[PDB]
């Protein structure tokens, strides 16, 4: 069957408050900070099985059995399964893939435990384990009391390190969601919570909650203060700074002879790398060094972009560690941090099916060259059987026209390859990738909530005359109340957001309960 029913939306009145701790107190007015059901909030009067996320707790009333208190709805996740069935108010702590919707009437799960007429109230609350089940079954007078003050004495801790996110009933049903709100509970002398005051409900309540009392006399009380405002304006120092030699090695026509690794010192900058990420399949994007991210963001001086051609069997050796035939005679790379070397085959681009014999490399140069040099030095090979020039017969070429073919392996396909190697120790970096141009600097509307230097305030235009090298301006005491737009001229003087002290004017809760603010 599917016996479902309707929904609603009701005003969760002054109720949903539970003894937050096992501590007795008498004739006090405590001021807690627990998670409660804020006063006069909205409860969703279900009449009909929903999936109901677990936003930190539930003031779960009812009027007419059990609940599934897991995160996923299946045989996976150890979904806790309560039940109150007049034999024992006991549990089920197993998985049990998708009980049909309700009422099965079991997996390798867990332990177990045992123990429309009225108001079986329930504030289930899970906090880093210990899914706690404060409750009170109030035999209400029918429909007349969906409000009236009642506290929810705990029932059990159940230390369960499990992460709940969902739940639902099976065989009323006002799900309300707990939030972090400070209350002012009023214990009588017997020890019971007879009242409460949601401190952030309204001005009057907030006043009671700073006077720590339930009745305030006439007067004007300074309760709290007031201001926040978000809107991010992050107008940035640069305007049109030169990019980089990037998109010049990634997109060059003729690279260097392989041992003459065309390292440059990549130029001043806006080397805001993202033009990196866009490219079509690289077949070598694996950042040989730090993660293939963060290069746009990090600011190193130069990454010394090298430029050379290879063919795949040599390209295999182009990596930190990974010493091999060409990083065993010609082109070696250090322990790490070879920038983000980006190899790719250049079939159509460096060899024709004539089997191009163009670009000279050095196998049998002498031996492996030491990590990351520039090898315009193409020292000839010690080949023995002769003292004169070392070279064995005569002229042992470390000049190997790469001698490949588009019909080989890509180990022997043409390969044009870009290399990087960043510098960051000495006099401050040149290359980096800040953002820019949030917006239209956002003169008034206390929004223009940064500028270059981080500021948070009303930030608009001014009428100062900043001596055209001076950029921001202090007041007599070291608070910058002026700034110039970086990308434009715009002498903007800044001013702080706003604030004060909300003071609450009341005739005294004996006369009335209206307040002026």
């Amino acid at each position, epitope marked *: 069957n599917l016996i479902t029913t309707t929904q609603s939306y009701t005003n969760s009145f002054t109720r949903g408050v539970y003894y937050p701790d096992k501590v007795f107190r008498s004739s006090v007015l405590h001021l807690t900070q627990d998670l409660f059901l804020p006063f006069f909030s909205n409860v969703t009067w279900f009449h009909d099985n929903p999936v109901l996320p677990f936003n930190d707790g539930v003031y779960f009333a009812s009027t007419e059995r059990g609940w599934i208190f897991g995160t996923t709805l299946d045989s996976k996740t150890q979904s806790l399964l309560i039940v109150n069935n007049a034999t024992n108010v006991f549990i089920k702590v197993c998985e049990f893939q998708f009980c049909n919707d309700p009422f099965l009437d079991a997996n390798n799960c867990t332990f177990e435990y045992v123990s429309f007429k009225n108001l079986r109230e329930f504030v289930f609350k899970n906090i880093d384990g210990y899914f706690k089940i404060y409750s009170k079954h109030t035999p209400i007078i029918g429909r007349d009391f969906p409000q009236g003050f009642s506290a929810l004495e705990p029932l059990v801790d159940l230390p369960i390190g499990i992460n709940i996110t969902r739940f639902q009933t099976l065989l009323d049903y006002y799900v309300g969601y707990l939030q972090p709100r400070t209350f002012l509970l009023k214990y009588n002398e017997n020890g019971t919570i007879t009242d409460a005051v949601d401190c952030a409900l309204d001005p009057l309540s907030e006043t009671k909650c700073t006077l720590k009392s339930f009745t305030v006399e006439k007067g004007i009380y300074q309760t709290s203060n007031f201001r926040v405002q978000p809107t991010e304006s992050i107008v940035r120092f640069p305007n049109v700074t030169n990019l980089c030699p990037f998109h010049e090695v990634f997109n060059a026509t003729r690279f260097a002879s392989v041992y003459a690794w065309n390292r440059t010192r990549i130029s001043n900058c806006v080397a805001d790398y993202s033009v990196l990420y866009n490219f079509a399949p690289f077949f070598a994007f694996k950042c040989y060094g730090v993660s293939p991210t963060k290069l746009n963001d990090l600011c190193f001086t130069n990454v010394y972009a090298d430029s050379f051609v290879i063919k795949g*069997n040599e390209v295999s050796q182009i990596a930190p560690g990974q010493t091999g035939n060409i990083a065993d005679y010609n082109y070696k790379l250090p322990d790490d941090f070879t920038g983000c070397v980006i190899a790719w085959n250049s*079939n159509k681009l460096d060899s024709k*099916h004539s089997g191009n014999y163009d670009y000279w490399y050095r196998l049998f140069r002498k031996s492996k060259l030491k990590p990351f040099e520039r090898d315009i030095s193409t020292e000839i090979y010690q080949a023995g059987n002769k003292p004169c020039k070392g070279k064995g017969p005569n002229c042992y070429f470390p000049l190997q026209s790469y001698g490949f*073919r588009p*019909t*080989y*392996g890509v180990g022997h396909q043409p390969y044009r390859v870009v290399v990087l190697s960043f510098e960051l120790l000495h006099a401050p970096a040149t290359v980096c990738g800040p953002k820019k141009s949030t917006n239209l600097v956002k003169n008034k509307c206390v929004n223009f909530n940064f500028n270059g230097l981080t500021g948070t305030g009303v930030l608009t235009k001014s009428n100062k005359k900043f001596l055209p090298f001076q950029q921001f301006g202090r007041d007599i005491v070291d608070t910058t109340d002026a700034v110039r737009d970086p990308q434009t001229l715009e002498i903007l003087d800044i001013t702080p957001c706003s604030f004060g002290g909300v003071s609450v004017i009341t005739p005294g809760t004996n006369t009335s309960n209206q307040v002026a603010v």
Partner: antibody
Amino acid sequence: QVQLVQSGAEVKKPGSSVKVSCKASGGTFRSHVISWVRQAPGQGLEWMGGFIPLFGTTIYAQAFQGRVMISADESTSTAYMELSSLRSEDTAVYFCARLFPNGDPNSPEDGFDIWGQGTLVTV
Amino acid sequence: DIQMTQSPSSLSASVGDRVTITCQASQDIGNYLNWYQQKPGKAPKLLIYDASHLETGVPSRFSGSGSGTDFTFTISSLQPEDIATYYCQRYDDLPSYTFGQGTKVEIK
């Protein structure tokens, strides 16, 4: 020179996977990206898809495009077609070849095709 | 893909039989044309690569030609053994391997 020893010839049945191996004949596999030939029974040709163990991700067969899970583990001296979700369509002689991107700097006479042996799959 | 087809698809011809076999694809191939022929009871044989320039092997009889949309793998002079089904793969510069249908050159 190089032979690219392939597994054999057996039939495989629907839903499951068909395993075959282009096995390593005395080195000469590293560049040699072991792609995979299919050779539809007698209606037409095909390319089973292969893996790209040359330092990157794998290409999948155009013909089947999504459950051609063609893995190939060159160091282990075995290739694979690894076609999960087979039904019947196979009935073919899937070859292992040195498909065009698979020449060595050696063996240029076996240029850009060092073919295999073939595997009769069917129902 | 250009999703390789050949168009003549079933050119029937005996010994010599001035030949025209052309792997005209859906669209243009440029210098990205394989021309295949399969040797029955064995593994395939790629004779020609882009438009021309036969492999060392599978002799000149099967001769590659044609540069345009349609690339002509004409036989100058076959013999009884040149029964070989003329499908055509297309080496796409990133692997795509779309083979053909079979333009078998016959004998009686």
